[PDB]
Amino acid sequence: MSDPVELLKRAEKKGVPSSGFMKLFSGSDSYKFEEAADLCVQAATIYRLNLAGDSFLKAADYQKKAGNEDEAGNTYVEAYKCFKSGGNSVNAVDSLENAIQIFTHRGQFRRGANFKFELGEILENDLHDYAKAIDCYELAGEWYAQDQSVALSNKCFIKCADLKALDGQYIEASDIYSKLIKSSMGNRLSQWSLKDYFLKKGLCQLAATDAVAAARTLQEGQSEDPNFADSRESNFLKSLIDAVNEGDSEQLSEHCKEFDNFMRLDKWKITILNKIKESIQQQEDDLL
Amino acid sequence: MSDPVELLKRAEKKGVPSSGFMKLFSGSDSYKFEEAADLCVQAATIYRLRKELNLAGDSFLKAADYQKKAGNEDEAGNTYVEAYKCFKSGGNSVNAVDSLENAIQIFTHRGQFRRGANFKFELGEILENDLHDYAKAIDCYELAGEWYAQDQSVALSNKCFIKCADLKALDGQYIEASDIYSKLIKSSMGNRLSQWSLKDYFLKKGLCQLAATDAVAAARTLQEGQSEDPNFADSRESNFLKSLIDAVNEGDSEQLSEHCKEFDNFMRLDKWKITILNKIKESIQQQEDDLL
Amino acid sequence: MSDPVELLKRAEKKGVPSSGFMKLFSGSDSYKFEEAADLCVQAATIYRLRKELNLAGDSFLKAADYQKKAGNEDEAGNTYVEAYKCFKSGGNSVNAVDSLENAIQIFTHRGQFRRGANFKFELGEILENDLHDYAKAIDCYELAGEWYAQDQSVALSNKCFIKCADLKALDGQYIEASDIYSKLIKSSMGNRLSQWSLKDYFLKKGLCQLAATDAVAAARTLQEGQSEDPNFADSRESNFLKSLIDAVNEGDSEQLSEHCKEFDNFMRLDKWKITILNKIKESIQQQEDDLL
Amino acid sequence: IKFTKQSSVASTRNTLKMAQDAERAGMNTLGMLGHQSEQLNNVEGNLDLMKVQNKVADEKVAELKKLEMELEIDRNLDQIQQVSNRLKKMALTTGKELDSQQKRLNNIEESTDDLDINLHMNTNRLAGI
Amino acid sequence: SRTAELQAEIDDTVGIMRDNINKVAERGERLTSIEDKADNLAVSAQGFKRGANRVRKAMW
Amino acid sequence: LFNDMEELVIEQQENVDVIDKNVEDAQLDVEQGVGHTDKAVKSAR
């Protein structure tokens, strides 16, 4: 079985550009980079995970030097596979950046959005670097929206608007809860999600202490979507608005427990509700 | 139709490498091995038409060996898979295992991990069900699950890790099974699609932790599941795990049996759960006996 | 990569037919058109890579036109299909319609009726959903269903005729919608696979006959279905159609609304059926108002 | 008396909840089966094209070689009954669509195998030229 | 009588869904086999391409 | 049952993706291969 170290050494030797006088006699350096990339891909296949990933990165760099950006993007995706699976999230991120850049330059925005969402997942879950995860979900959603893929765009914007609300960017999250609402009106497949969106929008507007906007969102949802009108989510949002207007945190706690009994509050709703509670209590203390 | 025995004899005759002085005048021996492999494949096809499946498998093994000698490893992997199919359909599980092992070694070597993971999972199935070699089945499923995780095939990786964890827990490796269930749980969080498997995973994790007499870890697993997955919070599985933990902490084997019957009436306990629950009961009863 | 604008310019220059004295010395103009078509296809492939898809479609249209001038109509149809794909992916439904139409005439002229039927159905979908040209979509589905019926593909023909009958009934065109449902019923008799669809067809037929204020034809449809298909006899669709007929004969719109709600509770009434049942209701109410 | 009515209300609440969950899963599965049906259509088209190309390849290779509790229970049963309907038609339509896909997949398998065999034959013939 | 009717419908739907589960298994097996054979097809197509190219160069 | 069905269909999506990709790739190589045999014949004549 060939030794991958020797293959990488041969790839390195072949990957030296012709400099000076021999450049007048040597053909295009593209072929040398192609052969070095092939050697690097072989080494990567034998290693196959971190050493396989590093070997695919070298291959992709040589493919870029050859003018074969195409294979370079594919090879960066392979490097990302190797890195993600080796627990090396940083190199996975780097590989996805290079692959996405190659794709977007080439006019594969769909593939770019796919890997942009994958990148956002790596940023959110493995690196906990939420800001760039928000950025990636937003940009992937935009690229899907250009492609007229409403479902994928909505998935990205659900993630993006949700990371924004947990980061305290409640107004911007509400603006993305609003886009999701318009993109989902009239679509029978999204009816269950639509109620959810209305609720979350109001919650952000309650965490931004704009109870008037929450009331308006409630009225809008009640008027535009009959399924939301009679839903437990609409009643819950109304009760939360009434409690916020009354400055009664204990009542809002009762409402949260009641709603929890019938439809479990997931971590996000608990989190946002806790800030709504804190705002009411802070107003009470300031009035004392 | 040609006689397959005659074809195999000619394959054997052609498959002799050039030795001595003849090697200076004979071209690459690859072509001789290719032709012998073709003859062996013909014999294998003839046997397969006659439903002499084991003989067809053996002929395919010979063909694959000649293909390996020719330098055509990809064709050798294809032919080993064919030999595996012939043996499996013939009830010769041992030769099926051998064929899949050679095929998997080749399919690995050519960077073909997803494929080798499919065949490694199939090998694990043959080991578990036909040969009852549970240890190698565990290894096969772990190996296949890791390779699927390498392809970002979360679903296939989860299937392999479910099999691995189940077999480990049945083998008395409760802690390692609990760790694999932790991996399954983490890989399934937030995916709407696996919600129903997710509840099951939490339950099983606690059960292994109860079979290892670590009730505290079972309680922590219950709390984690109740906090992280709302669908698990209200589930019958969470209440059942809580009740089992309470029974274990109380050292009351009869209450554990009552809870098992109650859970059985609403949600049938499959064989695995019955075995693990019996182990937990046995541990409680052993502690009771040790205190008298 | 070549500049596709330059490729199209070279295609345009090559695509000029030999006029005058030069025609006596120039070979067949077919080769020039072939080369221009190849250039246009290269420009189209470059444009498609760049996802400014409408221009890729335009380049494919130019390529197909040159291919038609070359006498190579089959490649012209293939290229029109490619142009259609580019336009549809680009949100330019009008040019997609034009491309599919040209491809369909090419295919039908060559006796490839099945392929033309496929693209005629797709064209009808583009008309129904993107352009809201329901009349010519009805025409498309009818003709595609006929072409499938000639090819003895009962299933595809039924799909097209279902779409045609639905659109006809929604347009106010009830009687011939019921006729198409009669054809669907006749083509679905005796086929176990279509058993679930058959009940649906009977119901819809009666509904159109109720929207045409022909309660007698609806009743005859009911007895026909009851006698010819035992599964429709005992079904909820048959009882619902009977109840609607009874309400229509009694001139009691509120009874019809109660039956619609009752059937809604056991059978959610899709958008099409809601429209038709509403129409039946206004017909009853109009008769009531005319009697006061 | 009251305790049983409360327990029954709770029963019908969970009953409706589970029914709705089932329906969500069914709708995703039908839409997802439709998407996979479209993909398989693309596969089918490509296989048809390859058949034609392999005819061409065969001829070229040949020539190449030649060269309040009661009311709530009632209403919950109403909503349950609605959803259970949706579950029944969804199951039936799923069986239908999937049966058609099973026959289609069988044909796809056979065509793929035949194309693979033809390509191997022509590659072997080209090797000797 | 309403609720029994409901129970009867749910029981029928469970039967249809058990049937469906059996069918989707048949489908998963078939799809695994088709993936393996489509991989074979792709490899063979590439091999046919390369062999045809080599014959093209030999003849040139 | 509905939950299990959804999960199985989600899993099977992986297979369908790969099949579509491989068959598409195969078709393009076959087309190229035929192109080569055409040119080979043109020369051999």
Numbering used by the authors:
A (entry chain H): 1 to 48, 53 to 292
B (entry chain G), C (entry chain I): 1 to 292
D (entry chain L): 433 to 499, 589 to 650
E (entry chain J): 27 to 86
F (entry chain K): 213 to 257
According to the publication:
SNARE (soluble N-ethylmaleimide-sensitive factor (NSF) attachment protein receptor) proteins drive membrane fusion at different cell compartments as their core domains zipper into a parallel four-helix bundle. After fusion, these bundles are disassembled by the AAA+ (ATPase associated with diverse cellular activities) protein Sec18/NSF and its adaptor Sec17/α-SNAP to make them available for subsequent rounds of membrane fusion. The disassembly requires multiple ATP hydrolysis events in the presence of Mg2+; as few as six ATP hydrolysis events are sufficient. The side-loading and side-release mechanism explains how Sec18/NSF can disassemble SNAREs with constrained topologies.
We chose the Sso1–Sec9–Snc1/Snc2 complex (referred to as the ySNARE complex) because each component of this complex crosslinked with high confidence to the D2 domain of Sec18 (Snc1 is highly homologous to Snc2). We prepared the y20S complex in a nonhydrolyzing condition and, after single-particle cryo-EM data collection and processing, we obtained 381,591 high-quality particles that yielded eight three-dimensional (3D) classes into which models were built. In the structures of all eight classes, Sso1 is threaded through the D1 pore of Sec18. A characteristic phenylalanine side-chain density in Sso1 is present at the same position relative to Sec18 in all classes, allowing for reliable indexing of Sso1. The nucleotide states and the arrangements of D1 around the substrate were also the same among all eight classes, with the ADP-engaged E protomer forming the top of a spiral staircase of tyrosine residues. Protomers D, B and C were all ATP bound and formed the middle of the staircase. The bottom protomer, A, formed the base of the staircase. Protomer F, with no apparent density for nucleotide in D1, was not associated with Sso1. Given that this charge distribution is replicated between each pair of D2 subdomains around the D2 surface, it is unsurprising that the Habc domain adopts multiple corresponding rotational states over the eight classes, presumably because of the flexible linker that follows it.
